[PDB]
Amino acid sequence: IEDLMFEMSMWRCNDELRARADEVHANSRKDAAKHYIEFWKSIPTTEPYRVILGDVRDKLYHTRERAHQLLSNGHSDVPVEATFINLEQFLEPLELCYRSLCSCGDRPIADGSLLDFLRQVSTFGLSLVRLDIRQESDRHTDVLDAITTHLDIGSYREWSEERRQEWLLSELSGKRPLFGSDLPKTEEIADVLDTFHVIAELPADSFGAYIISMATAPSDVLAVELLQRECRVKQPLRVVPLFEKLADLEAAPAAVARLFSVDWYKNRINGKQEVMIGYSDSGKDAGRLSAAWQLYKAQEELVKVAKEYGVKLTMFHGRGGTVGR
Amino acid sequence: IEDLMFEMSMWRCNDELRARADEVHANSRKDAAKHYIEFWKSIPTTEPYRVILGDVRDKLYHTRERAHQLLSNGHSDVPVEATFINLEQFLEPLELCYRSLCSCGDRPIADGSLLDFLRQVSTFGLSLVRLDIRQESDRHTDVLDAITTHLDIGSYREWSEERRQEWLLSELSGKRPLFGSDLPKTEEIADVLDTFHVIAELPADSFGAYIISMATAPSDVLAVELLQRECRVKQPLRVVPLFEKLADLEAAPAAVARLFSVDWYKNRINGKQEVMIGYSDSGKDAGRLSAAWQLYKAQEELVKVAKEYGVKLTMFHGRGGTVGR
Numbered sequence: 286i287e288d289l290m291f292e293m294s295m296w297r298c299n300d301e302l303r304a305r306a307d308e309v310h311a312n313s314r315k316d317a318a319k320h321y322i323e324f325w326k327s328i329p330t331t332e333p334y335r336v337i338l339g340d341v342r343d344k345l346y347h348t349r350e351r352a353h354q355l356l357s358n359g360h361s362d363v364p365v366e367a368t369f370i371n372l373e374q375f376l377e378p379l380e381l382c383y384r385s386l387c388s389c390g391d392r393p394i395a396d397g398s399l400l401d402f403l404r405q406v407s408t409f410g411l412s413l414v415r416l417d418i419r420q421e422s423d424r425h426t427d428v429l430d431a432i433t434t435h436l437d438i439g440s441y442r443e444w445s446e447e448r449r450q451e452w453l454l455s456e457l458s459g460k461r462p463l464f465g466s467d468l469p470k471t472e473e474i475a476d477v478l479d480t481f482h483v484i485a486e487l488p489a490d491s492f493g494a495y496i497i498s499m500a501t502a503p504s505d506v507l508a509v510e511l512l513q514r515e516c517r518v519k520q521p522l523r524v525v526p527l528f529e530k531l532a533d534l535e536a537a538p539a540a541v542a543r544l545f546s547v548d549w550y551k552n553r554i555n556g557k558q559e560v561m562i563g564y565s566d567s568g569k570d571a572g573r574l575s576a577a578w579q580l581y582k583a584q585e586e587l588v589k590v591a592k593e594y595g596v597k598l599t600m601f602h603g604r605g606g607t608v609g610r
Numbered sequence: 611i612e613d614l615m616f617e618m619s620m621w622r623c624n625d626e627l628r629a630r631a632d633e634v635h636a637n638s639r640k641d642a643a644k645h646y647i648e649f650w651k652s653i654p655t656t657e658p659y660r661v662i663l664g665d666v667r668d669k670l671y672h673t674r675e676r677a678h679q680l681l682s683n684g685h686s687d688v689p690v691e692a693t694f695i696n697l698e699q700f701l702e703p704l705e706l707c708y709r710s711l712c713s714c715g716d717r718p719i720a721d722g723s724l725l726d727f728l729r730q731v732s733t734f735g736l737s738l739v740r741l742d743i744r745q746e747s748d749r750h751t752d753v754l755d756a757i758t759t760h761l762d763i764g765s766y767r768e769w770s771e772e773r774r775q776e777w778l779l780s781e782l783s784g785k786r787p788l789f790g791s792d793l794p795k796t797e798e799i800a801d802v803l804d805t806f807h808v809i810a811e812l813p814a815d816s817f818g819a820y821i822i823s824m825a826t827a828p829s830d831v832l833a834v835e836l837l838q839r840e841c842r843v844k845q846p847l848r849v850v851p852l853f854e855k856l857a858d859l860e861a862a863p864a865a866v867a868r869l870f871s872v873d874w875y876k877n878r879i880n881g882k883q884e885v886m887i888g889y890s891d892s893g894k895d896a897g898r899l900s901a902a903w904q905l906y907k908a909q910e911e912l913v914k915v916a917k918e919y920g921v922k923l924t925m926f927h928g929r930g931g932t933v934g935r
């Protein structure tokens with residue numbers, strides 16, 4: 286950011302960026318700000334790009350200090366409003382600089398370091414990569430079974446698929462909390478519940494998708510959805526199944542259509558769905574050729590099903606480095 | 611405590627108090643401890659009573675400091691283990707000094723300042739007085755009705771006494787949380803829920819009884835019990851009805867017997883029940899004579915009911931200062 290501030294030494298801006306620069310120079314905090322090396326003096330309105338980028342540097346500093354404290358200890362005294370909280374609270378001031386530069390005939394300048402920076406921000410965000418959480422279905426099954434046993438209502442394990450679907454649906458559309466603090470938990474059970482609490486405690490733009498290994502029925506996706514909602518995951522992430530064994534690839538389109546049939550999920554999925562297609566285990570239990578061909582059929586029929594339900598499908602290819610995977 | 615430390619200058623103790631004083635002088639924290647004015651030097655095992663009472667002063671000092679912080683700000687860094695947390699963790703060392711003194715033929719000394727102190731602790735505890743929480747039944751009903759309405763299960767208001775009873779019982783004996791953070795609350799609703807949260811945050815020996823104004827049915831007491839359990843009140847306080855209007859005094863023995871009829875409540879009540887008897891409103895809506903007489907009969911029949919159910923009843927007489935109350 287300091288190198289970018291050095292280059293954005295222009296003085297022409299449109300009335301927009303001038304107004305905003307006046308805003309920042311208003312709350313300029315006439316202080317020494319000696320923790321910085323460069324630009325430790327309050328930036329003058331002569332060079333307005335440097336003013337706005339100056340506020341951007343302050344919010345970066347405080348974001349770094351907050352993350353470093355949050356990591357090094359368990360907590361941080363750094364105020365959240367002093368940091369970039371949004372993926373675009375960061376982007377906004379840079380967008381403004383770009384609009385101003387183009388407005389003032391400086392598109393060549395704007396397409397330089399400022400553009401590089403814009404693409405880095407829009408591409409990498411506040412957390413360099415979005416993290417996926419992958420876990421096998423049977424662990425979610427164990428969790429739910431502990432819950433239904435504890436609620437004196439049966440055993441989710443022993444329940445047929447239809448019973449699982451109806452119950453999960455009723456609990457997702459219901460308004461009463463499920464388990465409480467007093468739920469008996471295995472180390473595994475508490476592992477997955479705690480991972481959900483960890484996901485809820487953390488920023489939304491840090492995570493990607495929750496991938497369910499050995500997914501076979503909608504009860505598994507709905508299970509993860511309910512387990513998220515009940516772990517108070519404020520902005521729950523998209524759930525995606527992983528079909529890797531060959532039989533799962535044969536049965537996959539049927540299962541996806543049956544999932545989209547659920548009006549609730551089709552309404553909350555918001556027209557977009559991702560499903561992972563594994564390449565590792567297919568050519569292991571059956572013929573490599575049979576695996577490749579069945580994969581082709583799988584992609585084809587998955588797209589068919591998604592178009593049939595008016596949902597934008599993006600398929601996740603779990604390819605390896607070796608041709609055998 | 612310092613004056614007590616000064617008088618307890620004996621050198622004879624039994625082996626019990628000797629062992630303990632040696633323990634305390636072991637972890638004596640060989641430091642300056644200059645915040646105290648008197649006894650700032652590590653107390654020598656020569657004066658064992660002073661060793662023990664000296665530790666008592668450390669725990670009192672830290673208890674006062676924690677209480678003062680907890681009051682003046684919202685929180686305290688003072689570790690809880692440094693304080694007296696139990697109303698008798700305090701009593702123990704003093705009991706020990708008393709036992710030791712009597713062992714050594716010093717019962718007279720034990721019956722001086724030490725005894726006064728024992729009685730002051732055992733009578734006033736860590737919180738000078740135990741605080742009652744009183745609220746009228748209709749407010750608990752409003753809360754419950756908001757919950758049953760929000761849970762799309764009906765209207766607690768419109769429900770018969772029997773329906774209220776069966777539902778409350780099922781919820782008391784159930785293990786699932788009731789409402790969540792998303793329960794719509796009036797300012798009154800959130801008032802009573804918040805008082806329960808305040809009760810849960812605070813120590814148990816700080817509170818006494820929860821008095822229900824306008825109590826008429828077991829549903830009212832069961833209601834307060836459920837609201838305590840659901841507000842995570844770890845050690846819920848005893849619920850006690852208040853009969854003050856003349857009709858309520860007439861119906862009181864019946865309503866109290868009807869309460870004891872619920873085996874669930876009678877088994878949890880631990881053989882003890884308190885019920886309040888108001889003296890203010892009776893001689894206002896009827897005569898003073900009719901009210902006095904009805905109060906007498908009411909006490910009589912209440913005792914009969916409690917003896918029939920093997921419950922030790924203690925009655926709370928809300929007498930005023932004027933004869934008319």
Ligand SMILES: [Cl-]
């Ligand atoms: Cl119980």
